[PDB]
Amino acid sequence: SVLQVLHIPDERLRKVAKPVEEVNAEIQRIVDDMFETMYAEEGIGLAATQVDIHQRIIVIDVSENRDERLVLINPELLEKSGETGIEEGCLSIPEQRALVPRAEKVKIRALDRDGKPFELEADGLLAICIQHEMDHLVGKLFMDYLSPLKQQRIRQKVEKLDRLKARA
Numbered sequence: 001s002v003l004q005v006l007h008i009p010d011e012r013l014r015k016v017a018k019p020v021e022e023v024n025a026e027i028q029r030i031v032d033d034m035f036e037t038m039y040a041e042e043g044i045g046l047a048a049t050q051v052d053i054h055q056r057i058i059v060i061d062v063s064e065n066r067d068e069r070l071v072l073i074n075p076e077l078l079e080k081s082g083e084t085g086i087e088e089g090c091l092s093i094p095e096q097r098a099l100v101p102r103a104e105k106v107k108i109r110a111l112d113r114d115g116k117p118f119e120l121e122a123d124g125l126l127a128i129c130i131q132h133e134m135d136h137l138v139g140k141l142f143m144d145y146l147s148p149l150k151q152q153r154i155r156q157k158v159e160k161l162d163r164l165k166a167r168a
């Protein structure tokens with residue numbers, strides 16, 4: 001199923017996710033719906049809290065053939081180094097992009113879709129994607145890094161877009 005993605009300024013985007021107790025068929029359903037939703041809106045990453053499911057689950061797929069699926073359940077940042085930034089987007093902040101400071105390299109521990117643990121070292125776009133999605137799980141958005149003026153301007157942009165998109 002395709003789930004509805006929340007937009008700012010929805011307050012449910014600020015909730016802190018609980019860890020997944022047990023990776024069972026209900027969780028695997030959520031993972032599958034999250035991928036379906038992410039591909040349907042043309043995203044490369046999605047956190048559970050974006051679809052109003054407040055558990056520590058993330059899906060990523062940067063591939064163009066939509067077949068290098070990455071699932072992070074209960075991710076844990078083990079180490080990070082360096083600093084970078086690209087203009088990030090987000091399905092919760094429609095059509096807005098902004099450069100945000102990130103670590104360049106990241107090492108995480110997570111569970112996969114089967115509930116088996118794995119470690120992953122990432123750099124480049126992947127490292128940035130993981131950090132952006134892990135932020136979502138503790139109620140952080142990429143706009144939080146920007147000036148108050150930039151933040152307001154982003155909010156207004158989105159509110160205006162949702163105002164027009166709802167036609168009637």
Ligand SMILES: [Zn+2]
Pocket residue numbers: 089090091092132133136
């Ligand atoms: Zn996002």
